[PDB]
Design a protein around this ligand. Sequence first.
Ligand SMILES: *CC(=O)N1CCN(C(=O)c2ccco2)CC1
Ligand SMILES: *CC(=O)N1CCN(C(=O)c2ccco2)CC1
Lengths: 304, 304
Amino acid sequence: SGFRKMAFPSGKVEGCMVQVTCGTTTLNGLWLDDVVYCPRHVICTSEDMLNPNYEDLLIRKSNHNFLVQAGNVQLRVIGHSMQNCVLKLKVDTANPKTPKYKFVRIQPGQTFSVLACYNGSPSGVYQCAMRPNFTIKGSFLNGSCGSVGFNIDYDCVSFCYMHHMELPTGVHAGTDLEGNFYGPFVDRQTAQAAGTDTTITVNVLAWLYAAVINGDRWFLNRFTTTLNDFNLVAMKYNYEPLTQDHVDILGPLSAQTGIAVLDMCASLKELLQNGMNGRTILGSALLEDEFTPFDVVRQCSGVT
Amino acid sequence: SGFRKMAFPSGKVEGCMVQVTCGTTTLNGLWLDDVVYCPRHVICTSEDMLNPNYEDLLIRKSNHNFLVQAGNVQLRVIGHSMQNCVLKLKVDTANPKTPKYKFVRIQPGQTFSVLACYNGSPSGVYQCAMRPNFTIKGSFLNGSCGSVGFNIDYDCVSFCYMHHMELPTGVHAGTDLEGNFYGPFVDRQTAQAAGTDTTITVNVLAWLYAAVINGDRWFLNRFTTTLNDFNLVAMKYNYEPLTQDHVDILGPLSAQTGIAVLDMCASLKELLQNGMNGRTILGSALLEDEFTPFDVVRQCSGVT
Ligand SMILES: *CC(=O)N1CCN(C(=O)c2ccco2)CC1
Ligand SMILES: *CC(=O)N1CCN(C(=O)c2ccco2)CC1
């Protein structure tokens, strides 16, 4: 029993973190096989980051200008290229700790673990969600860029995020491991405002299911609703529209608990309309939206 | 910027988890050097766990009855002993991945990372606090016993917790790595009720400091208080008494922010008396008490 905001074990990713230094800029890189992946802004002076021309800046850089250090051993860089907003540094040694891995581009509402690193050294691990406005709410100080987000399926690390920037509002923006930003963000120090941070409805429902399974039941009511009726209330409270796809995804949690998805919708509807009245659910005073239906099943079933 | 409930990187502890099987009971064990540490209740039939006599049960057990598996390789058990509520299984092979380590017995209010495991395989990592009633609020299913709690100081893992039991109220009890329970709990399936789960005052204040540092400032007021005046309000709200020791510990966060500890006490006092009025602090609708002053400094400074 008990339900916790739970990250994947980080060891497989710890084994992949290196330090990348270009001139006076030191960031993190991800070493998989004989490639090191890092944010292309490693090549910028903070002056450059006002309006950088990365192709032009990169002409001035050689293999030997990229200093790559794994623990306290230097890797030999034998090639470099830019793919979107990342650099791929070819090194002469395959990472002996390379796990089975994939690069995946997640959808908004999907959750992942971040291994926060500084100078290629892990400081901590936490669970995130790709927000509907394509930001993440992370914990990233200067030096943390190149820290990655991942999921693990048994022995395969799916890398979904690399950290690139903090918006003036203190929320975070980054790329997949092909170097394509999530959302409309650019690796430039300019006016970039996030859109509406809406609540991930399907995740709230999954977490209400988790609460029932773990004995927190006070919010279960006598009501049901329809997708359309629920969605009117969702819209009013800046919740994501609930789709039949979302209902299908919640099917197994529905089955296990014997609470129809639309009944749990009606419970969530009353919580939105009435508030918590100073009560808590799984130790929260607000409705948690950074557990996926998959996360709830995994943690409630004990997958390794 | 941003502040997250952050666990230590788990890799060093992942390398220490094994499976222990005695008859039909399979739990987790911690392999350090040539010793495997596990809960002594590995020897019990669930019938036994009503009123077990562990010394008597252990007479019936040989080295060869303890099946120890590290990945998919069996370890040879060459000795076994009971220390308090843990078994120490001597194996013929030193764990090659043994990190630098210590066994520490933490105080209530101290935080630690848990690596939740099943069958000696890591499923996830989360941050906990030793509650003032010597319980922890974890995420533990059947098979999770022998999962451990730890802190890391650069390269040294301090092991502070091994998971042994769930109370009927779905909160968790366990031992240090000398096998001594935290609090008054016993490894018996009997009536065991937790005392008052009071709020860790010094941790709330540390987290209010974290909030100020990360730009969440709406709750800062024009007031101050005294330790005695604050403590009257603390008592009323089932908060731990604040001591001069706690004030001294918050000194560096006071210094960094320029907010006197007693001013932040007065802010917390108004939050207790007035509530959040539907507002949030670092994305919470309640006052978080599972960050230590040390945790706030570490995460705000980016220690690795
Ligand atoms: C995410 C990260 O580590 N960084 C550090 C490098 N960089 C800057 O310091 C910078 C330059 C101009 C604006 O910010 C980006 C963030
Ligand atoms: C923590 C853990 O893994 N367990 C599993 C073994 N055990 C029981 O199933 C049990 C027997 C009697 C009561 O509970 C303790 C908890």
